[PDB]
Amino acid sequence: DEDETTALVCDNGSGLVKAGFAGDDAPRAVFPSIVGRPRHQGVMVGMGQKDSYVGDEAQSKRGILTLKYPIEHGIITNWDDMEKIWHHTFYNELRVAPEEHPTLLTEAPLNPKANREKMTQIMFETFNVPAMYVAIQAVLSLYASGRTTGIVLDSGDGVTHNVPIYEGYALPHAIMRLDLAGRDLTDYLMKILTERGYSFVTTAEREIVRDIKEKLCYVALDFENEMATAASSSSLEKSYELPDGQVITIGNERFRCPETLFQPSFIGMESAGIHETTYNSIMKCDIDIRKDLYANNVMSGGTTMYPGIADRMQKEITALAPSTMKIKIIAPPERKYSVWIGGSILASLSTFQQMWITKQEYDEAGPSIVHRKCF
Amino acid sequence: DEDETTALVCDNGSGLVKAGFAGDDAPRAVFPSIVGRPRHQGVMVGMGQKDSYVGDEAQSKRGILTLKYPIEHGIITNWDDMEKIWHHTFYNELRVAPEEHPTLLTEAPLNPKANREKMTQIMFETFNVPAMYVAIQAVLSLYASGRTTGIVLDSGDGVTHNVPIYEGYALPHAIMRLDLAGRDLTDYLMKILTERGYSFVTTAEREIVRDIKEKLCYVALDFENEMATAASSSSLEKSYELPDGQVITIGNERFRCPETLFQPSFIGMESAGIHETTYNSIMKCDIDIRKDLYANNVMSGGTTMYPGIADRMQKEITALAPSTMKIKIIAPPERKYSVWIGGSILASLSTFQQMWITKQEYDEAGPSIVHRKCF
Amino acid sequence: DEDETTALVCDNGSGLVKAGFAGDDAPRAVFPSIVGRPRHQGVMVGMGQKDSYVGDEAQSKRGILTLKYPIEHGIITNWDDMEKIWHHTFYNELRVAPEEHPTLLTEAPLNPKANREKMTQIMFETFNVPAMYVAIQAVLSLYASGRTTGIVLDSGDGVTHNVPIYEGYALPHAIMRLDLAGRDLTDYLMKILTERGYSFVTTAEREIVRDIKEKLCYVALDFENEMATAASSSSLEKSYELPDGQVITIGNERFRCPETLFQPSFIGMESAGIHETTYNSIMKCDIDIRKDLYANNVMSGGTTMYPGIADRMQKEITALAPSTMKIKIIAPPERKYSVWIGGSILASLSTFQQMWITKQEYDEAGPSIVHRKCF
Amino acid sequence: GSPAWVEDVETVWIEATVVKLDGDAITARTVNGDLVEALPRDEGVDDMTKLSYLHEPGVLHNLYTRFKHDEIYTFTGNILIAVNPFTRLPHLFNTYMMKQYQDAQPGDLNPHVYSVADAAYKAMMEEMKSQAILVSGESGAGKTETTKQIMQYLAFVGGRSVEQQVLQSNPLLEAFGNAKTVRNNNSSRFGKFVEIQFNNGKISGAAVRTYLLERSRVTQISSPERNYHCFYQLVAGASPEDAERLKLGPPDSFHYLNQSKCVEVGAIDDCKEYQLTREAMDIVGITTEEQEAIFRTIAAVLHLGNIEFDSSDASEVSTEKSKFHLKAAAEMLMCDEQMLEKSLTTRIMKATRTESITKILNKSQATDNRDSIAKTIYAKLFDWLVNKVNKSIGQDPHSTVLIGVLDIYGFESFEINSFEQFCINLTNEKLQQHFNTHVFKMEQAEYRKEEINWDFVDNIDVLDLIEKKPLGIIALLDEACMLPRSTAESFARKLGDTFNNHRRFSKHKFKRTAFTIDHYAGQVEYRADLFLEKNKDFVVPEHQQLLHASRCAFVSGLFPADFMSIGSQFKLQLAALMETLKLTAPHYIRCVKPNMQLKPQIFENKNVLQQLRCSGVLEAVRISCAGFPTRRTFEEFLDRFGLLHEKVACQNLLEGYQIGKTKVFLRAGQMAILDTLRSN
Ligand SMILES: Nc1ncnc2c1ncn2[C@@H]1O[C@H](COP(=O)(O)OP(=O)(O)O)[C@@H](O)[C@H]1O
Ligand SMILES: Nc1ncnc2c1ncn2[C@@H]1O[C@H](COP(=O)(O)OP(=O)(O)O)[C@@H](O)[C@H]1O
Ligand SMILES: Nc1ncnc2c1ncn2[C@@H]1O[C@H](COP(=O)(O)OP(=O)(O)O)[C@@H](O)[C@H]1O
Ligand SMILES: [Mg+2]
Ligand SMILES: [Mg+2]
Ligand SMILES: [Mg+2]
DSSP states (O other): OOSSOOOEEEEOTTSEEEEEETTOSSOSEEEEOOEEEEOSOBOSOSSOOOSOEEGGGTTTSTTSEEEEOOEETTEEOOHHHHHHHHHHIIIIISOOOGGGSOEEEOOOSSOOHHHHHHHHHHIIIIIOOSEEEEOOTTTHHHHHHOSOOSEEEEEOSSOEEEEEEETTEEOTTSOEEEOOOHHHHHHHHHHHHHHHTOOOOSTTTHHHHHHHHHHSOOOOSSSSHHHHHTTTOGGGOEEEEOTTSOEEEEOTHHHHHHHGGGOTTTTSOOSOOHHHHHHHHHHTSOSSSOHHHHHOEEEESGGGOSTTHHHHHHHHHHHHSOSSOOOOEEOOTTGGGHHHHHHHHHHHSSSTTSSSEEHHHHHHHOTTHHHHSOO | OOSSOOOEEEEOTTSEEEEEETTOSSOSEEEEOOEEEEOSOOOSOSSOOOSOEEGGGTTTSTTSEEEEOOEETTEEOOHHHHHHHHHHIIIIISOOOGGGSOEEEOOOSSOOHHHHHHHHHHIIIIIOOSEEEEOOTTTHHHHHHOSOOSEEEEEOSSOEEEEEEETTEEOTTSOEEEOOOHHHHHHHHHHHHHHHTOOOOSTTTHHHHHHHHHHSOOOOSSSSHHHHHTTTOGGGOEEEEOTTSOEEEEOTHHHHHHHGGGOTTTTSOOSOOHHHHHHHHHHTSOSSSOHHHHHOEEEESGGGOSTTHHHHHHHHHHHHSOSSOOOOEEOOTTGGGHHHHHHHHHHHSSSTTSSSEEHHHHHHHOTTHHHHSOO | OOSSOOOEEEEOTTSEEEEEETTOSSOSEEEEOOEEEEOSOOOSOSSOOOSOEEGGGTTTSTTSEEEEOOEETTEEOOHHHHHHHHHHIIIIISOOOGGGSOEEEOOOSSOOHHHHHHHHHHIIIIIOOSEEEEOOTTTHHHHHHOSOOSEEEEEOSSOEEEEEEETTEEOTTSOEEEOOOHHHHHHHHHHHHHHHTOOOOSTTTHHHHHHHHHHSOOOOSSSSHHHHHTTTOSTTOEEEEOTTSOEEEEOTHHHHHHHGGGOTTTTSOOSOOHHHHHHHHHHTSOSSSOHHHHHOEEEESGGGOSTTHHHHHHHHHHHHSOSSOOOOEEOOTTGGGHHHHHHHHHHHSSSTTSSSEEHHHHHHHOTTHHHHSOO | OOBOOBOOSSSTTBOOBSOOOOSSOOOOBOSSSBOOOOOOOOOOOSOOTTOSOOSHHHHHHHHHHHHHTTOOOOOOTTSEEEEOOSSOOTTTSSHHHHHHHHHOSSSTTTTOSHHHHHHHHHHHHTTOOSEEEEEEEOTTSOHHHHHHHHHHHHHHHHOOOHHHHHHHHHHHHHHHHOOOOSSOSSOOOSOEEEEEEEETTEEEEEEOOOOOOOGGGTTOOOSTTOSOHHHHHHHTOSOHHHHHHHTOOOTTTOSTTOSSSOSSOTTOOHHHHHHHHHHHHHHHTOOHHHHHHHHHHHHHHHHHHSOOOOOOOGGGOOOOSSTHHHHHHHHHHTSOHHHHHHHHHTOOOEESSSOEEOOOOOHHHHHHHHHHHHHHHHHHHHHHHHHHHHHHHOOOSSOOEEEEEEEOOOOOOOSSOOHHHHHHHHHHHHHHHHHHHHHHHHHHHHHHHTTOOOOOHHHHHHHIIIIISTTOHHHHHHHHHHSSSOOHHHHHHHHHHSSOSSSSEEEOSSSSSEEEEEETTEEEEEEOSTHHHHSOOOOOHHHHHHHHSSSOHHHHHHSTTOOOOHHHHHHHHHHHHHHHHTTSEEEEEEEEOOTTTTSTTOOOHHHHHHHHHHTTHHHHHHHHHHSOOEEEEHHHHHHHHHHHOOHHHHHHHHOOOEEOSSEEEEOHHHHHHHHHHHHO
């Protein structure tokens, strides 16, 4: 366990679950959240073959396993899965008896109430945690970057949200939420690589496609002369190696796969795109406090790591927003670990001590108290 | 009988029946499986002359006997023959009352169900064995070589199969089976030696031809400069002695007789050949797990003992498969006794104790239970 | 040639190539698409023996020919083959000089772009067709059945696709494509008949297996009491005659061979099966237009002719979909000739006259214009 | 209510008799003073069998009292118990004390063990020929001096120098055997046995049955007990010219002897000890050529430990870079270099009827083959020394009556319970099972003697879950040892996933791999380190042929007569030793020790509690209290009834008592309840 009764901070966030003790500056446990099942008949005896594979063992044997992503779009689908993944993160990675430290979990905004009610119920009644608290993934990014106050434009593999935070207060009348996330870029890439001739259908290929998206994708400055010029010459075409030893060439689809985050008509959703989401989020605040947000709008979340996101977002705001207005985008380079670093501070480095949910209050109140306390 | 109630392991495998107790490292009984009948009239009294010759007495008197191979291409033809050969292997070689030890028999993959149903029926109802089990000749080669996981490329005198095994699981959607086996190389050699001038028609000659195939055959590296160069000089031509005292010279047919295992158009079957069988077997697995199989594809079975099989197979994969890919062929030199050595472990050295077919279940279920249990 | 300059409509579709003039209600030329090669040595002089057999002569001599299916899974493999089959369909069946009429070809959705670029290139540059157009095999089924608007659930020997079409518009964000097609049912049947004891390995047997699949297969209502009850009595067992004069009995494999289209775990692919493919295709459309598709989902393609497909699909949707919802499956009985009948109308009976690719535009643009025009 | 014991940190049961407090809130004063708010009632003594309370408080109080009374107080219990006083025994091992032990039957048998030795000698004289006495005691309990005093008492009794020869033989045995364990820098060697054959009372024959050697100490070692004392003595360099004649390098040079940084030890002068061992071998009668051959054999074992193995398909063959250690090993063993290399890398024994195949084994197999050759060689070396030991000992002229003595390593703890320690725990478990069976037989004899109808197996359950089943833990370990690529953690997962419930044993905490098992001496969690690498063993025939036919004559005599699981052969050998011990009449003796100060008038209640737990003295007390612990005569019960408030009158005043023939076989808790009724 731990050499101190400091609390435990872990984001589950539907992608790569991040976990570690409070008061650190580095997360001590990171793995891709995934639940594996053997799909084929076994004949060889004695190599374990246990029907519950999870995490970093799961990407090792990922050729003969089905894949089950447990958390989708910010909603939790199957509770046996999260019951499994909590137990695996606690007992195998940080080897911690969970009844020694309180915990801090998180969510996106606007998630359904039964989900938070289940999550609050489970750690108390199955793990007997002393205390629990739920934070907001919009908030802690600012405690990560230091208190600059503004728009937190964070998009992970689950969702995308737009929360303005001013001066110590949040604005619940004008937050936003979209579903173009990491998964939809994967699934657009699946239909996109099929144009070249390649073909991927099964879910074991999904984490391979995720790798190519993680490497060879960059957000073009213009979306017309790029898609004309790379169609005019192969200067953009690079290569990659599938784990068999093949060589796959990539055309203009290095940029068209995250292009649709600024043009979400391609995948058939109807919405604004994330830049107009940011702008319409700002226009629903007051005319008094506006000009801070234009200079203190902060990115976060691992889907915003494509090399060109900053200049593209800046040019799009500058064309969109009123003219004589200084616009300034922070893009801190630990952003893929931003949120947990936020959970680094807020658990340990505050007066956050009576603000915990004492389990006594849970035994007196039931689950729904986590509605009326933590936000 | 035995000094211990350990089970009994015997492969019948249509060629040389291998038999012995579990827990040993050496098979205690080996003979060519063959059933002999006298074909000519007897006049001399009192020298036995019993009309059921079998096995190692059978190759002694093999001039005036018909030959009846009982098991063909993995299928059992006549059940009186196998009823004979089981009784001869039990009572004469290992002198064992069969109702003291369970038994382990085997098969190739994809053999017809009535065959396994007959074999399961006979030992229980005629010999009253306590327990029975059927294994797969694809599997136990890995327990022979130690658990390397890969393609088991095994070809005996019966069949040739290609089973991939990964990590504790087998892949039944992409196994293979061909019929180019030991017998077809004999029968190609029969039509091949007739080109030189020699002539063999009767079945007593068959085991003589089998001997020359067992000795003077080697798999050429190239199949063109060899067949041009040995046609240019007699450096390859060697000699052999038929049991009369004659001397027979062999031309380029030292290599052309197993050449057709990589070119099976000669004998008029239509198929790929065994190397393209291996490659097409691998390509019907996932792109995730491939690169293990290229380095852990394991030969077996006594037809793969021709001096040159390893380098030829390696060069053929390397030309065939994608390029930057390490390919590695294990060729363990006890391979002609591989399968039984596999049956050495799996009977005795496991938790393989409730996995036996208790004869009680046979009396309650009938034969078809051996369908639903052992694979 | 023709008594009118109406265009020419032919689907190639990897199976039985259908061809005929526009404006008719009956296809005038139908043959199994296959390319034949002699594999054995000829000695008899003067019986033609030409090394390019194709089509209906090819199923006549199919004992001593290799078989080469030219088009696989919707992709075209060898272009000499399609160069052959186009020339044979034009010059021998409809005896038409191809430079007199425009042509209409087709595809599945999501086929690789180089394929359509090759097909567009070849008729223009080798046959000098006046005009060309490529349609979608999802579309024309509705013009066949009359404009009911819905899911086109069509599966030929190439592929299976699920396209929703509403009200005059298609939904490219939620089409589907699977590869369980006619060929995979043949290849499951090949491994299935081997359980009974029969044995088929060579490619000349493939068209014989195709016949038995075309005759004695029917989709069971339940998949458990059928596979228990036919295992309890031989009421389902029928007989068939191989062209030698043998009699082969068929067990429960009349229904298990197309059972796997609703359970595609058997052949080791990982997917949903076609009914859940249809349901997941519908759930990715809007909540506004849904209830039309439940009552206007239309089958097509010759793999959906097994006697029981309609009730099975209906019961599966009704268990799957939300309850109080009228579900209605059209199953028009010319469905095996549906697509070409669709090509009957759309070429001749529209304003489809400037929508053709004038060959002038091809000489000014190159092949890639067939990307930007026809869809 | 006030007179009781009190559990505390230092005084684990302090007999605190102050105030009758509440039932669980027990607030009173104590010997240390006033305490806060449940230990049992409290009431130097020779036997506590008639005590009012049979508890660890009264037992520890009598122990500390007899430590203060300087008496080695041996309770009768069908088993005695003494303490190492770390002082001289005047008039206790004396001949007049021996004459009194030969004379005084009932009186002197209380604290004295030579009187118990005389009683055992009389029982052997009472036609109970097959008889032996168990000697419970740890490292430093004085059991060797106790056995010497018992041999002196037997020589005074039986008459008929074997003791001096036994004294001279222990230096040769312990040097070949002992190392620097966590409990002793001069540890034990192994299980040792002795048998004195009597020629109708004339004790004349010497025999030994020392088995169950520490074979795992050859290559696997992880603590200061790596260097054997013979191995360290040869590493000490008992001859400088013969070092160059044997090419013997430094103590750090041998990689097999490079385990856990205990090269220099502040416990032994191994050069002078090696000279003393050579003198003792000459006293046993070892030839100088025999001594040179033994030294050359140990040197060859060291060079073979230094013989590195290496990795075309390189994973089936080896190489040679520091081939000097290989060539020196070939020279010191007097065999061909290429022949020994082929016997290493080949393992070629696969023959069918006339064919022969050469299975060129892998590098991980090759290192195990080297380890197997070494473990064969050293075991043969210990066996030849045992043969010479039994030769120089000399037995009797086909005598039929012998008396046995046994000294084996018992239950122990460490920082981690290794598979060697696990096997030692299994040995102590089987020994405790036999001792508990003897105690239960004595209890049933005492019940049938007083005609008491008095109506353990979980130890047999622990033995079953460890070894005895066909799906046992030793069996599963052997099973996973065979099938390759068996990960250690994967072994642990099945280990905790088979027999998961239903034991005094389960899986570890939130840790990597350990298996917690509650043996009779308490709960130990053996940490699942490379037991799967330790228990591997192999015996091939061609290595036996190379050992038999090599040019070294003594080495040829060490393997002249030329299944694969160390747990399997250990189970067979331990079962054989238990079956051999089963044929004799049992006695038991417990040697306590004041190991705190290693001096007189000192006590370590933690170490004494560990001694009573490991030897099962507390467990024997529990098994004794399980039956009818209180047993007082009808006059004794009448006196107790008169003190409280004639057997019928006592039954009327009282109404688990069961009046037997003349005693009242009752419970000690009933005796404490009667004492509370007498006090109230
Ligand atoms: N090049 C890249 N570097 C880092 N992350 C990337 C990259 N490309 C895509 N990603 C996405 O970033 C995500 C990182 O996890 P994320 O969803 O940001 O966690 P959270 O949900 O807690 O915000 C992954 O889902 C991955 O899809
Ligand atoms: N040189 C050779 N050495 C060993 N076996 C050979 C040789 N040449 C051919 N063989 C073939 O190897 C076969 C050995 O038996 P095999 O069929 O492998 O047993 P199984 O059917 O159990 O695999 C024999 O049929 C024999 O035809
Ligand atoms: N009983 C049957 N009747 C008609 N067609 C059948 C039957 N059984 C199977 N089929 C399949 O229907 C297919 C008809 O051609 P199809 O592939 O539908 O053309 P297209 O590819 O244009 O849709 C053949 O491949 C054949 O395998
Ligand atoms: Mg995440
Ligand atoms: Mg055989
Ligand atoms: Mg077709």
